[PDB]
C-alpha cells in the first residue's frame, strides 16, 4: 500500500475538495465523525482506502489532505461544516488577504510568506506515510491563489519530493461563472511555470460542466454546489483505482505510463456518462453500449472540443456498476465501425478497461439520479489543444495593449515573464499540431 496526499488550493480547489471527500466518505462507509464500522483493523492497516485515509487509535479515518487558501472565509466553512471532525486543524491553512485574482500576488508577494508553513504541514502528512506515491493538486487556473500559489507549491514539491508523481485537477475558466477579466493571464502564467512539474493534469472547463448541469440536470442557473457535485463524481471515477482493489491505474506512476507517452502533452480529456436528473420521476436505465457510445459525444466531455479532428495517443474506460467485459468489447466493436477514432501511427489502437462492480454513489438530496452503470473515459487526444488556442487568443488580445499588466509588474513580476509564458504555450500548441495533423 502506497499513500497519496491531496492538496486543495484556493476557493475552487477547496470547494471541489469538500465535495470529493464528502463523496469518498459515502463510497467507503465513513461517517462525518471519521468512524468506519466495516473497518475491522482498529488504529491502522494497509487496505486500498488507506491510500487516502490514515487511522487513529480511536478508529478515526482522517483524509491525507491539506487545504490552503490566502483568505479564511472558504476554509472557515470546512472548519464549522458537516465534515469538521474529519480534519485536524493543522490540515486547514488560511492567510488574512487573498491574491486579488493576480498570479503575481499569489506566486511572489503572498506565496513567499506562507510557502514554508504549507510545506511544513505537508511534511507532517508525508512523515506518517510508509511509501508516499505523491500528490493530487486541485486548483483553478483563473484565481490568484489557484494560479500563483499552486505554481510556487508545485516547484517546491519537485525540490522536496523529487521522485514523487504530481497529478493536477485544474478548473479552466468560463465567462458564465468567472470573477476576473485577467483569468487568461493567470491561466498561461501558471501553465508555463507548472508544466515541467506536473506528470498528468485533468482540465475541467467550467463551461462544459455548466452546460451539462443546464442540459442534463435541468438546472436553470447552476451554482458552484451543482458544478462541484458533478466534478466530484468525475474525480471519484478517476481516483477509484487508487482507493479500491483492482489491477489498472493502481499507482500514480501508472496514470503517466497509461495516458502520457510525451511528457509535455499530459492533459487527458475526461468524458462521463450518464448524467441523469434525480428529479426525473421516470428514467429508462442506459446499457453498456449507450453509456460507452456517449463517451464519444462532445456534449459529455469535461472540455468542449472535437476529437474527430485530432489523434488519440491513449484511451482508458473506467466503468462503475453492472458491467462485464463481453458487453464492453461488443460496445467497442460497434463504436469502431461508426465513429472517427484515429490513433497516432506510433501507438496501438486500443482501450485499457477498468471495471469496479460498486455502482456510482450519489450524495443524498443531490441533483444526480442513482444509475446501474456509469463510465469515465480518459483519452489523450490532440483535440484538447483547442482549449489552449482559445486561452492564447484572449491572452494575445489583452497583452497587445498591455491591459492590466501594471498589476503584475507592481507585485515585482517582470513583463518578460508574460512573453516567455506565451512562447511556451506557442510551442505547446505547435507540439499538439505536430502529433495531431497530417501532411
Amino acid at each position: 500500500m502506497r499513500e497519496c496526499i491531496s492538496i486543495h488550493v484556493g476557493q475552487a480547489g477547496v470547494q471541489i475538495g469538500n465535495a470529493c471527500w464528502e463523496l469518498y466518505c459515502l463510497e467507503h462507509g465513513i461517517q462525518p465523525d471519521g468512524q468506519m464500522p466495516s473497518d475491522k483493523t482498529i488504529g491502522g492497516g494497509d487496505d486500498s482506502f488507506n491510500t487516502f485515509f490514515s487511522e487513529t487509535g480511536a478508529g478515526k479515518h482522517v483524509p491525507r489532505a491539506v487545504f490552503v487558501d490566502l483568505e479564511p472565509t472558504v476554509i472557515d466553512e470546512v472548519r464549522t461544516g458537516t465534515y469538521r471532525q474529519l480534519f485536524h486543524p493543522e490540515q486547514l491553512i488560511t492567510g488574512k488577504e487573498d491574491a486579488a485574482n493576480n498570479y503575481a500576488r499569489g506566486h511572489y508577494t503572498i506565496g513567499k510568506e506562507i510557502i514554508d508553513l504549507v510545506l511544513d504541514r505537508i511534511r507532517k502528512l508525508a512523515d506518517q506515510c510508509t511509501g508516499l506515491q505523491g500528490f493530487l493538486v486541485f486548483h483553478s487556473f483563473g484565481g490568484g491563489t489557484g494560479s500563483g500559489f499552486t505554481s510556487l507549491l508545485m516547484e517546491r514539491l519537485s525540490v522536496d519530493y523529487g521522485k514523487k508523481s504530481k497529478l493536477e485537477f485544474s478548473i479552466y475558466p468560463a465567462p458564465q461563472v468567472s470573477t476576473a477579466v485577467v483569468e487568461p493571464y493567470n491561466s498561461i502564467l501558471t501553465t508555463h511555470t507548472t508544466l515541467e512539474h506536473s506528470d498528468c493534469a485533468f482540465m475541467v472547463d467550467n463551461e462544459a460542466i455548466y452546460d451539462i448541469c443546464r442540459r442534463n440536470l435541468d438546472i436553470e442557473r447552476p451554482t458552484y454546489t451543482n458544478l462541484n457535485r458533478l466534478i466530484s463524481q468525475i474525480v471519484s471515477s478517476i481516483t477509484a483505482s487508487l482507493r479500491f482493489d483492482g489491477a489498472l491505474n493502481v499507482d500514480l506512476t501508472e496514470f503517466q505510463t497509461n495516458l502520457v507517452p510525451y511528457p509535455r502533452i499530459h492533459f487527458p480529456l475526461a468524458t462521463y456518462a450518464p448524467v441523469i436528473s434525480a428529479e426525473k420521476a421516470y428514467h429508462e436505465q442506459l446499457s453498456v453500449a449507450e453509456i460507452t457510445n456517449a463517451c464519444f459525444e462532445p456534449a459529455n466531455q469535461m472540455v468542449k472540443c472535437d476529437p474527430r479532428h485530432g489523434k488519440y495517443m491513449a484511451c482508458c474506460l473506467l466503468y462503475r456498476g453492472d458491467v462485464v467485459p463481453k458487453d464492453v468489447n461488443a460496445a467497442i466493436a460497434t463504436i469502431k465501425t461508426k465513429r472517427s477514432i484515429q490513433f497516432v501511427d506510433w501507438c496501438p489502437t486500443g482501450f485499457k478497461v477498468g471495471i469496479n462492480y460498486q455502482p456510482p454513489t450519489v450524495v443524498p438530496g443531490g441533483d444526480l439520479a442513482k444509475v446501474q452503470r456509469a463510465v469515465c473515459m480518459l483519452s489523450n487526444t490532440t483535440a484538447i489543444a483547442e482549449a489552449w488556442a482559445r486561452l492564447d487568443h484572449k491572452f494575445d488580445l489583452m497583452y497587445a495593449k498591455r491591459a492590466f499588466v501594471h498589476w503584475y509588474v507592481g507585485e515585482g513580476m517582470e513583463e518578460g515573464e508574460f512573453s516567455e509564458a506565451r512562447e511556451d504555450m506557442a510551442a505547446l500548441e505547435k507540439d499538439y499540431e505536430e502529433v495531431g495533423v497530417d501532411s
Binding site: 465567462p175 458564465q176 459525444e297 468542449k304 488556442a389
Partner: protein, 342 residues
C-alpha cells in the same frame, strides 16, 4: 438584429450573400475580429473552428464544414475513395487514380500501366495537383519531380455538335446544418471552343475545359454560346434532339447518386448535429460524361464561384435554406435523399 463577420474578401458567392443579409435590414455586419457574431463567413485556410461555439447566448453558424478538405483536395479524394468500404477500390464512377510524391503509389501505378501496354488498351493518363497528358509513364513521373495524382484520362468523352468539342459539368451542392444535401437545379457545362484531337495531347486548349484556359488560348471563345457556358435547358434540348433522351435520365440520376455517395461517406466525420457550433458549406462538383453517357467525378471544390447569371438565385438560395433556417426573419434545390430497404 442577427450579427455576422466576413473573413474572406475574395469570395464572390459570400460578397453577394453579405449584400443580401444587409438588405433584409435584420442583419448587422461586425468588424472581422469581433467574437459576438451569429454567422462567420470564414477564411479558406486555418479557419479557427476551435474558437466557435464558446460565446454564451449566441447560436453560432459557419459556412464551412471542418474536415470537408478530405473531399476537396485531389490527393485526399483518391485516398478516401480507395479506403472507405462504402466507396471501395471497385467504385465505378471515379477514374483509376494513384497518389504520387516527388504514402506513395508509384510501383502499383506502373503495374497497372503495364496491363494496358500488355493488352493493347488505350493507355493515356493525366498528372495534376491542388497539368500534363501523356501515353508515356516516365514523362509524367519526370514532370511531377520537376504532391500530385496520376488519373486515367477519359479517351472517349461525349462531344457536342456542332464543333466536335469536349466539356465538363459543374453542379452546386449546399449541405445545411442538419446535413440535408441540396442540389441547385441549375448546373453549367464549361465547353471547349476547339474540336477534340485524340492524336495531339501537346495542344491542351481542346483537352482542358477551364473558363480561364479557353478565355486566353482558344481562338473560338464565345462562338457557340455566351462565355463557354451552356445551361441545362439547352443541353437537355440537345440530348432530346440528337440522342433521344433527357438530362434527368442520361446524366442527373448518376450525378445525384455520386453527390449523395461522397457526402454520406464523410457525414460521421464532419456532421455538426451534436456540436456546440453548426456548419453549412457550398460545394462545386465537377463531372465528365463519356460517349456511352456514363458520368465520372473529376473533383470536388470546397470554395467554388458561380456562373454570372446564377449568382442572384443561388445566393438567395443560400440565405433561404442555410442561414434563415437557423436565424429566421420576422424551391431552387432538389433535396438528395433515398431510404431503400435491404
Amino acid at each position: 438584429m442577427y450579427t455576422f463577420v466576413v473573413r474572406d474578401e475574395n469570395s464572390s458567392v459570400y460578397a453577394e450573400v453579405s449584400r443580401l443579409l444587409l438588405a433584409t435590414g435584420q442583419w448587422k455586419r461586425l468588424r472581422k475580429d469581433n467574437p459576438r457574431f451569429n454567422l462567420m463567413l470564414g477564411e479558406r485556410n486555418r479557419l479557427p473552428f476551435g474558437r466557435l461555439g464558446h460565446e454564451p447566448g449566441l447560436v453560432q453558424l459557419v459556412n464551412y464544414y471542418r474536415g470537408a478538405d478530405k473531399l476537396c483536395r485531389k490527393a485526399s479524394l483518391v485516398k478516401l475513395i480507395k479506403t472507405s468500404p462504402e466507396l471501395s477500390e471497385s467504385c465505378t464512377w471515379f477514374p483509376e487514380s494513384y497518389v504520387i510524391y516527388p504514402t506513395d503509389e508509384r510501383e502499383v501505378f506502373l503495374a497497372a500501366y503495364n496491363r494496358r501496354r500488355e493488352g493493347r488498351e488505350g493507355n493515356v493518363w493525366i498528372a495534376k495537383s491542388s497539368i500534363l497528358i501523356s501515353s508515356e509513364a516516365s514523362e509524367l513521373l519526370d514532370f511531377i519531380d520537376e504532391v500530385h495524382v496520376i488519373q486515367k484520362y477519359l479517351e472517349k468523352p461525349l462531344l457536342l455538335e456542332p464543333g466536335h468539342r469536349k466539356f465538363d459539368i459543374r453542379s452546386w451542392v449546399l449541405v445545411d446544418h442538419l446535413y440535408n444535401i441540396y442540389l441547385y437545379r441549375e448546373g453549367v457545362l464549361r465547353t471547349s471552343s476547339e474540336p477534340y484531337n485524340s492524336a495531339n495531347f501537346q495542344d491542351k486548349t481542346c483537352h482542358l475545359t477551364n473558363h480561364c484556359i479557353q478565355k486566353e488560348y482558344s481562338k473560338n471563345y464565345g462562338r457557340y454560346e455566351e462565355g463557354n457556358e451552356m445551361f441545362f435547358e439547352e443541353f437537355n434540348q440537345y440530348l432530346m434532339d440528337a440522342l433521344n433522351t433527357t438530362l434527368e435520365n442520361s446524366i442527373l440520376l448518376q450525378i445525384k447518386h455520386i453527390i449523395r455517395s461522397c457526402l454520406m461517406c464523410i457525414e460521421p466525420a464532419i456532421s455538426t448535429k451534436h456540436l456546440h457550433y453548426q456548419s453549412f458549406q457550398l460545394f462545386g462538383f465537377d463531372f465528365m460524361v463519356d460517349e456511352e453517357l456514363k458520368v465520372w467525378l473529376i473533383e470536388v471544390n470546397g470554395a467554388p464561384a458561380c456562373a454570372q447569371k446564377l449568382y442572384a438565385e443561388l445566393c438567395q438560395g443560400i440565405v433561404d435554406v442555410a442561414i434563415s433556417s437557423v436565424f429566421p426573419l420576422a424551391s431552387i434545390f432538389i433535396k438528395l435523399h433515398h431510404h431503400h430497404h435491404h
